[PDB]
Amino acid sequence: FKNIDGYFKIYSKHTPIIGRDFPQGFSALEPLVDLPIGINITRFQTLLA
Amino acid sequence: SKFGAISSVLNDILSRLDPPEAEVQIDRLITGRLQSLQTYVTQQLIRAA
């Protein structure tokens, strides 16, 4: 996620990789949504299930 | 050489004028200094030949 001049950009790629942890083989990221938020972001938090 | 600008010192022009007006003067300085460097490089080429 990035917030240059607003325009929130979300990149992603879903694949069942080897599954130990962060892989070593290279993988690309395909942008999914690019939406102009145009606000002030300073802190970040994640939700659960 | 002021090259047709207000002053000859980049740190003076930057610290004295705002960005969007000092842009013209710094562009003039770029066009002059880089042309001088180009002439020097060409003369070096001839001397090297």
Partner: protein, 145 residues
Amino acid sequence: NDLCFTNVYADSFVIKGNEVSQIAPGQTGNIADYNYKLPDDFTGCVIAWNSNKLDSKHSGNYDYWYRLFRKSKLKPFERDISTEIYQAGNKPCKGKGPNCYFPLQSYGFRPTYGVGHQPYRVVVLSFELLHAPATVCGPKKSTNL
């Protein structure tokens, strides 16, 4: 009316006469530095028309507001809506009076002011002339490829 714009942003507000000269890409003044700041690479239009028939009345009208006291600068296209008293000296003072100033003062308008003091209704338009799927157009034409 012969272009395509991905997104159009229409800001709106009421300001005085000299502030119209103030409002411009990267300018100076408390309005341009603590109230509203445009990006240096602004691509859009500014619109200003004197409006003393809705923003003025007998006995005055002080409903409008503007900020003169803010700790730092405004970044382009930010708000900051807040009522926090400016710190003067070193006092953590919270209130009105000496060395404790209200951040924003009234922008009061009356039917009888000078031209530079007359309500100047200003609306600005922001455009994004970049490579993206556009939304808004004018006369549309289409021929077979």
